[PDB]
Design a protein around this ligand. Structure first.
Ligand SMILES: [Ca+2]
Ligand SMILES: [Ca+2]
Ligand SMILES: [Ca+2]
Ligand SMILES: [Zn+2]
Ligand SMILES: [Zn+2]
Lengths: 181, 168
């Protein structure tokens, strides 16, 4: 499985639930050979209130059975550690993959935290962050912000991903705006 | 394996593969270049051989698809997951599928088919994802500028050789 990860904002908009939780158990094949599931302890839920969850409705995060086919692989030492899992809902189940935005909450910049808690929604319905795969990138509609990180330094967690957000500014115009915090 | 089908390594050195269909994105002849150059990357570091076929079932069935495409893992449209592959074994195993919704390019102006095929083939041979960001087997597509200077991470070499040995 190979993939281009999403910018946190796109992670927030396109996901069905943006939960905060701790990984309670090691992967086990549930009622299907196709997916492996992790028992999780959900603390805070930033998105997906059309699925409740409160503190214990979502107790399992699914992902494919094998890495080659996009299964997510979690390996942390402290189980009480908290993560930001942005995932989709196949049926009524939270799914995650190799690309799914999963990072420990404490590693998240103050800006990113603020975006997840309040600002990303603002850019969902209209703006759309587009990841540049080369140097001339690609001019897109005014509502697309050119995610030009990686190309410099070669990383999944650059500046635009740690301090910037793609918010609207004029009809048909979306802009990279800073979310200081 | 224990629950899902598949074997740790191919019990033969001479593998066969087939490029089932083509992506409009790129000229048929260019796909052949990317895939073949991709396979060579692993032949150089092992005693493995790859013979291209055009009919019948090869070990590695390479193909382009969009959304639903047969297996239990539909592709996510443009972006995110660019491709997936299966581990050594019978049938669908070893096969590699590619997301057509992506912009496939033979150059540094799109999603480099070579780079991705090289990665996926590693799975068809029995490799897993690497944590070493410099390793090809790292899942996150890191697109490098000048293609000419592409190099395998020592880690991948130690990885693939610990399975198939180095070239004789
Ligand atoms: Ca096969
Ligand atoms: Ca895709
Ligand atoms: Ca395409
Ligand atoms: Zn992979
Ligand atoms: Zn597939």
């Amino acid at each position: 499985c190979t993939c281009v990860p999403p910018h946190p904002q796109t992670a927030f908009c396109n996901s069905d639930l943006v939960i905060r939780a701790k990984f309670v158990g090691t992967p086990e094949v549930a009622q299907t050979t196709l997916y492996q599931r992790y028992e999780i302890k959900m603390t805070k839920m930033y998105k997906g209130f059309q699925a409740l969850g409160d503190a214990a409705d979502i107790r399992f995060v699914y992902t494919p059975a094998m890495e080659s086919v996009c299964g997510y692989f979690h390996r942390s030492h402290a189980r009480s550690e908290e993560f930001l899992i942005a995932g989709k809902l196949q049926d009524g189940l939270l799914h995650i993959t190799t690309c799914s935005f999963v990072a420990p909450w404490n590693s998240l910049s103050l800006a990113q935290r603020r975006g997840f808690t309040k600002t990303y929604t603002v850019g969902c319905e209209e703006c759309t962050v587009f990841p540049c795969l080369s140097i001339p990138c690609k001019l897109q509609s005014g509502t697309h912000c050119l995610w030009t990180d990686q190309l410099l330094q070669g990383s999944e967690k650059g500046f635009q991903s740690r301090h910037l957000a793609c918010l609207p500014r004029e009809p048909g115009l979306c802009t990279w705006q800073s979310l200081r915090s | 394996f224990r629950t899902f089908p598949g074997i740790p390594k191919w019990r033969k050195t001479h593998l066969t593969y087939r490029i089932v269909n083509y992506t409009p994105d790129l000229p048929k002849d260019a796909v052949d270049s990317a895939v073949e150059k991709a396979l060579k990357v692993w032949e150089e570091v092992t005693p493995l051989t790859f013979s291209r076929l055009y009919e019948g079932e090869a070990d590695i069935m390479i193909s382009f698809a969009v959304r639903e495409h047969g297996d239990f893992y539909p592709f996510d449209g443009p972006g995110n997951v660019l491709a997936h592959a299966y581990a050594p074994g019978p049938g669908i195993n070893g096969d590699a599928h590619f997301d057509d919704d992506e912009q496939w390019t033979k150059d540094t102006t799109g999603t480099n088919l070579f780079l991705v095929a090289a990665h996926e083939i590693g799975h068809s041979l029995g490799l897993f994802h690497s944590a070493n960001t410099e390793a090809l087997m790292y899942p996150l597509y890191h697109s490098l500028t000048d293609l000419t200077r592409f190099r395998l991470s020592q880690d991948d070499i130690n990885g693939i050789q610990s399975l198939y040995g180095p070239p004789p």
